[PDB]
Amino acid sequence: NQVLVPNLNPTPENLEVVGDGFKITSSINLVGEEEADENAVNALREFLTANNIEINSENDPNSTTLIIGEVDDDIPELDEALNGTTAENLKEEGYALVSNDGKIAIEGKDGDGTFYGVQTFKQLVKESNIPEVNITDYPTVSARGIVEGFYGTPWTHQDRLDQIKFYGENKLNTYIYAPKDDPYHREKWREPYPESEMQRMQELINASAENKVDFVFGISPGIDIRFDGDAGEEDFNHLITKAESLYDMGVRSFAIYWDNIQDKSAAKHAQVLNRFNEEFVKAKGDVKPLITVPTEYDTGAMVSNGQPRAYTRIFAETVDPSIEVMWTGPGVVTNEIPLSDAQLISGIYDRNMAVWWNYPVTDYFKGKLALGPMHGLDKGLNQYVDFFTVNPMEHAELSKISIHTAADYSWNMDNYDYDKAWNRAIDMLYGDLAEDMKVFANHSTRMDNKTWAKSGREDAPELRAKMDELWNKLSSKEDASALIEELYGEFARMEEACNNLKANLPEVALEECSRQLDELITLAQGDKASLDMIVAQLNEDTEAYESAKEIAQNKLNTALSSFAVISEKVAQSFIQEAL
Amino acid sequence: VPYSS
Ligand SMILES: *[C@@H]1O[C@H](CO)[C@@H](O)[C@H](O)[C@H]1NC(C)=O
């Protein structure tokens, strides 16, 4: 009978079911494709082909009709199909979508908008069934996406192309190219890319345009750049030459980065930025605002007693208002960006800020996977932030979980529920394996190197609660056998899920997390022996206690010398507590 | 150092 609205990501701002839904016919009437966004139509064409829906040559009135276009197209048949709903009054990138009575209309506020309308369309359709809905939709934050700016092995060409498809499909519109260990990015920033790297860039730029992603070409010259006299000219001209050869392949966004360098010449940094902004960005006329990150880029390094440090004050005083400025929040890697930290930094800079969010990056603690949702970022952040990017792992595939939630948070910020988003991320990504992937991933959300880097939702918090309850019940001598049995089940379940993931994950995921799958299976076995210890102590069975103690020490020993790190404060720490 | 410390 009725067609339910499937999982959608991001969450559309306004959605109403207006009917029972309908099945889309074998072949459809497509209207508006001549004037509609070229990329939206290609996206739509691929989806139709992938789902064996043909486009009729000649209108057949017995077939589903799909109308598509932007506000600024003169197509009356579209305005008739929206039934008084419009994208005219929406912010840029917004769209309206209506399916009723065998018609699907999509109207983008602009081309980006029409492409995004197609994305939502694609998510709504299952086995030819679409619900009947009226949608108007638009992003909270106008720049949303990813900065590949981590240390360690950069993503491959194949990784990047696949990521860019993934951004498109989740309405992320920004990808900043800035890998720390690309030599031509940083170590040898003056040197041109060779012919073949330039060909790989071209493919990246093309795929970005195809997927409505702003490819941002970053460069980090702060290691050895000269600011004064003829050397300053020469080194500035090296920036221009480099940026120009990416402009010449189609790049329209640029970033100059000053993070993690010894030189703290604020004014000279800001002068390089302003000169480039005048001589390059504005001169070109079709280039987006310049992006930067200052040498002090977290609040702790930027601010001292409510008042900016020397560097920051001078940088902010000099850096042209049009330039986007990124900061990571209260620390490099931190639990939170409270609304007040944003207010503070946006105060000093006197502009809306850009966030460089260092999660799920794991270059500072490579043994663990960061597989949680966006967590700790205030839902009113849009008031001081208009540009949002996450720094992912050197593992592109598994970064997808966290990035999926980044798409939800930055598109529809105030509706964002990290737990619901996290569940949706895994459901949409893992299909048949979702429920198991959740069991595993649930243990791998918290990042903590025990010093400066701490971020993420806590590892399996419900399980910790039960573990904590068990210790309370034992020390106050209450009957724990209901909890005990419950706990055997959870540990068994961790083992069963992990063994199923190992057998069934496709290679692309499996090769990113197989060591951590072994780790969690190990720990689950040690948690089980840990309980066998508890029970033997209760039953005064020394034989059975010494025997479970050995097993529990043998699993803990394996985990402690593992490169893989998982569930430190939950599965791991339970064995330590029992010992 | 291959991280931000
Ligand atoms: C420092 O922090 C992260 C984590 O190590 C690193 O990936 C990044 O390149 C550095 N810069 C910023 C601005 O976070």
Author numbering:
A (entry chain A): 39 to 617
B (entry chain T): 392 to 396
Sentences from the paper on this structure:
Reversible protein O-GlcNAcylation is achieved by the action of two enzymes, O-GlcNAc transferase (OGT) and O-GlcNAcase (OGA). Although it is unclear whether CpOGA is a physiological OGA, it shows significant in vitro O-GlcNAcase activity on O-GlcNAc proteins in lysates from human cell lines and possesses a putative substrate-binding groove conserved with hOGA (Rao et al., 2006; Schimpl et al., 2010). We report the molecular details of the interaction of a bacterial O-GlcNAcase homolog with three different synthetic glycopeptides derived from characterized O-GlcNAc sites in the human proteome. In addition to extensive contacts with the sugar, O-GlcNAcase recognizes the peptide backbone through hydrophobic interactions and intramolecular hydrogen bonds, while avoiding interactions with the glycopeptide side chains.
